[PDB]
Design a protein around this ligand. Sequence first.
Ligand SMILES: [Zn+2]
Ligand SMILES: [Zn+2]
Ligand SMILES: [Zn+2]
Ligand SMILES: [Zn+2]
Lengths: 310, 297, 311, 313
Amino acid sequence: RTIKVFTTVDNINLHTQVVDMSMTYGQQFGPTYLDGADVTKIKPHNSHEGKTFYVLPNDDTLRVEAFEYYHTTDPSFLGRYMSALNHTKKWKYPQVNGLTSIKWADNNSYLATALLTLQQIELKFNPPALQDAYYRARAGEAANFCALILAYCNKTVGELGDVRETMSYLFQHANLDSCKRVLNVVCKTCGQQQTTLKGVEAVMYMGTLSYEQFKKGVQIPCTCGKQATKYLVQQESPFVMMSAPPAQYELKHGTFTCASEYTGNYQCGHYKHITSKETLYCIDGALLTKSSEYKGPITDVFYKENSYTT
Amino acid sequence: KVFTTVDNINLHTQVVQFGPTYLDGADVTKIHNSHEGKTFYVLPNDDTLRVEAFEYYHTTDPSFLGRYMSALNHTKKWKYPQVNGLTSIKWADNNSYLATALLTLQQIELKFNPPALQDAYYRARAGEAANFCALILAYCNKTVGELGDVRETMSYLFQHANLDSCKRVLNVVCKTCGQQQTTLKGVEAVMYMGTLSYEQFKKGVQIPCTCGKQATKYLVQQESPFVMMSAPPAQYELKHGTFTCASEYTGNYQCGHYKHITSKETLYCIDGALLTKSSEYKGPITDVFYKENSYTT
Amino acid sequence: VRTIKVFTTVDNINLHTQVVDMSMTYGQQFGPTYLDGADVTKIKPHNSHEGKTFYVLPNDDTLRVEAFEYYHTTDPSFLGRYMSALNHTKKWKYPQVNGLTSIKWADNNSYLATALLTLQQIELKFNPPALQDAYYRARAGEAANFCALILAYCNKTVGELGDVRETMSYLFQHANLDSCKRVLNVVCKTCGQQQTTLKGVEAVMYMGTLSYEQFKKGVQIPCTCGKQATKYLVQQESPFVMMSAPPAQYELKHGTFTCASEYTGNYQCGHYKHITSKETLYCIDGALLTKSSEYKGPITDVFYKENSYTT
Amino acid sequence: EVRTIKVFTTVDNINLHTQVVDMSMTYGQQFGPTYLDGADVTKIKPHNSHEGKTFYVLPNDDTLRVEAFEYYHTTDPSFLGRYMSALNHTKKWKYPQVNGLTSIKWADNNSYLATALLTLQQIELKFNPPALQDAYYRARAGEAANFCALILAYCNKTVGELGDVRETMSYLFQHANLDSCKRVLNVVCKTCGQQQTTLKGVEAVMYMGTLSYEQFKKGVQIPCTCGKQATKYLVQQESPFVMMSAPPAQYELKHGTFTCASEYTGNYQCGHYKHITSKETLYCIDGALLTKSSEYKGPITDVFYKENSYTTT
Ligand SMILES: [Zn+2]
Ligand SMILES: [Zn+2]
Ligand SMILES: [Zn+2]
Ligand SMILES: [Zn+2]
């Protein structure tokens, strides 16, 4: 009339619980998952004796362990993650030019480029769930990782994704604490003026794709209206991410690590991944083609960095 | 010496002018010697061509053939693999909605009225479905690449099928205002919006009444070869052998993707060119189609 | 147990006395019930309703007959759809324009005004008494009954796309066109000459050309062989002809025609205007009136006077 | 031998850029697609009067792209094109005032734009893109033609194309500042159990499935994956208005009980929206026409209610 079972939010803590066998797991735990399967409407069939189930964080020690694993506190995180996972484990993640990609499915082009970029920049995620899923994605098993990205960005399977917005969300969960970007500008009405940026904001700029153009200054307007020049004074980070609204722009081999291109219906668009290895490579989900140069609508280009002073 | 047509049945003899002109969905307007005795399409710019066009497509819109050819330029480059015995469409240009419709039409008994459609459908059933798809786009006023709604698409297409043998009778009761029995015919006899479950439609569903109370609507009589039930996408469970086929939609109104579920020996999910078999299927369903001949409560 | 006597009707001619419990709504007792076009199904009777007449739907074998002989439709849904249409058409304006009753634009109704304006310009007689009555009332500036009836007969709802050509065919089926006959000949070089005879609606509508003289001089059409045949009018016995074709730029010359209909705008949710030839050309566009020496436009249907003709 | 004027080009019409035009080359060749007050001038020879006039041009360089990302909050390269094409038609529309609001006399199947436009003057809304916000003020003042063109292009709809009020409010609401809006819902199934979900932003102000906000407070039936009918209700709602939509159905509006609603006559292909607002009594605004009524019965499809902060009992 009862069965012994375990419930967890992070798959490591496993609190014991005694289940009625006359009630549904849902009646007892709220929404409940057995190996990704939604068993909320189900009554114990023995079998589960000894098994472990995923629950949403109902009590206060569950919310703690969940925050410590996912570094979020949204009650609806475990469930949006499983909603998306029901579809992501059905995708197929082939290796492409050494890297783990995703074949087209459910308008995921922006996820495949996002994931191919993450494997070329050196980045380590604080939240234990992310880093574990990120290592498994590197091994060809990126289903958990993709379902985590969708959940961290508040996106459902199939919605329109935006690479810059997707990476902005993830980079806040990445260990970018030690990244410094220092910017100075010439007379507005102030001659010189100096600012400093830290963390996620240090490695991200909207407005121009050319890292060198950014090094050598960009003329942006100033408080009175005089077109001053912003220039990269110093930079300390493992990479930088230059974005800009999309236009015909030319990817010159050996001048950037990787980049993303957006084509097709603007509202439900398509993304392609451009990476520079021996020659320029275009990774398109599962379709790989090589070329000496590239021209297309480029949104966001990725470059590697150690330290920079001008 | 060539042939200009609008419908491919009636050839007008020419020598070589025509206006916007097509040979196999390529815009050869702004331009040989191997084009001898080969048919060309053109836009109807005379009363004889407009009547030929009306008779063949069942449209009087001057732009139909235009948009037909425009769409066909892309759909000729789509692939149409055979999947589980049906013609489907390799994903491209956000066409999942066209694939699901296409896979549904083969599984339900339907007769199109306009010669263009019935002939294009037979080719699609044979594997050459570029014309059928391009007709659907033009009938629905959609361009390649635009996102599409399967419920919308079937409504447009059913407008062009013989469904006047299909009769549906419904009963509604509110506690204050009594009963109202209504007879629906044609397209409204096969399409219902509000719920996915056919059995629940027979047993009553709660809908609002101007009264203010919730009334309850149920199916009294039904004469048709199939029915189609729709509702906003929502997690829903499909059980082998209780339905004919169904559509799943991931995402939202701006950008999403359809897949197709069919019930054979086991549940098969067709996702364009890919097929995965399944003992059960749950996901966000939006349309379910059921076999029918004659039901009376 | 308060009660009153009231009348229930399907046609507002044959009235049936009923006694109604006042503790029960009209809906419980009759089904859908109306009082001068207003849904009163949810309400219980008042003292004041007393010998008033109420509209119901056909809910017994005897009522289904009165509806048939009055509307010439067996379709059970017909009276309910007419009432729903009437909720909005009673709200439409029916101003006079140039001796004719028209309809101020509303609810994508441009096709109904062209249809109505045409009907007051051609001799025609409807069989269904309901239609005939609504028509007379239409001429008198009270066309709401008529519009609701056309909608019902054409299975369209308020605001939907209408089609002047579909609309008129529907109606003509409800007109006495038995004294109308047309004869045509098709001569193909390969196949020969065959004559067919047309009786009824088929006799007064052609779908190939807006030009009635052309139909007399012959028009080219497909032939079962493959060659363009030529079909021409040998004789026409009818009060009018309606010539229709897919819309094209086309010139309406003064005095050569009774009236036409123009179709513009988004083809999927389009606009119609009415062209009628009097002392000058008059383009009636709902409430607005224009007057011109000539007219070029995308004409969709042309109406012509006719009594008898032999080529 | 040579002739030139000085025009301004812009993307936002705030950052004017001084340009000398070779009066031997159409604005097109010099600038690319160029517009004057929504009129395409790509391939028209310049004029001598065209001096000092502000010209709109496509963003064809990094600086303008960013001037235009800050202004329209969209990076779609066709935005200006679609905005100007709409604009050239919406400047020809009439903007009569009905009942103190800016409406639109009917043309080009614009009824859905008028209802939306009337609705946006009665609900507390703030837009994030300066372009919508800037046009919004002008629209209230009585000059709404620029606003209407922006709506058209933010929604990817063209003049004359049939529109859907609910679809358009959704698009526009994504550009509203709605992060201080929060909705807590609770679903209860006899079999499957209890689950509470929270919504923010647009998802907190729009609900589809019922017209009545009071039912939503009291409980609406919806299918559950178990197969039973579950019950959902408003635990906690916090926003200045709420929006309730249902597929159009005969339904009664009652004075004082709401802010405004939309009536729809037609089907999925051709249709007409009307507007209803609750002031001293009910007012049906049909573009230009105004007609009064004590109570309103018709095919309602969207209802708007005012809100402050509501927590269930
Ligand atoms: Zn200054
Ligand atoms: Zn009721
Ligand atoms: Zn022949
Ligand atoms: Zn349940």
